[PDB]
Amino acid sequence: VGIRFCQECNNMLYPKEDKENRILLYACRNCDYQQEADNSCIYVNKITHEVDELTQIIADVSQDPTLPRTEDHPCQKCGHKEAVFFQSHSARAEDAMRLYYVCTAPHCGHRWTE
């Protein structure tokens, strides 16, 4: 799914077919470097784009004074009562008004969705 960079000129690698051994290869086009491929996948396109927003949510968001916060929903890691919640905060998110919660208190930085 991702890209891998060349090991000799530090350039971008491209997929190349091995005619003899029938094994997928990544060969840099600006030199002769070749490396074996492990994932065996080249192009991945998620039309629904259902990527979990929890990965895109930054823990320091909990520092925001402008964000609403609730005592009802506790954290799952430390069980801290205080939690800050906000919506998708993103465009092209299909139709989703669901809430994303971030646990406050330092060093926790936990993000969960209900």
Partner 1 sequence: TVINNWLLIEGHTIGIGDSIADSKTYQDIQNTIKKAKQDVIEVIEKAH
**Binding-site residues for Zn(2+), please?**
6, 9, 28, 31, 75, 78, 103, 108
Among 99, 105, 109, 112, binds partner 1 (CB under 8 A): 99
For 13, the enclosing helix (H) or strand (E) is strand 13-17
Burial class (CB in 10 A: 0-12, 13-18, 19+), 100: buried
Is residue 98 at the binding interface for partner 1, with CB under 8 A as the rule?
yes
Kindly state the number of chain residues that form the binding site for partner 1, as judged by CB under 8 A: 3
Cβ 85 to partner 1 shortest distance, Å: 8
Integer Cα distance of 75 and 70 in angstroms: 11
Among 78, 96, 98, 113, binds Zn ion (CB under 5 A): 78
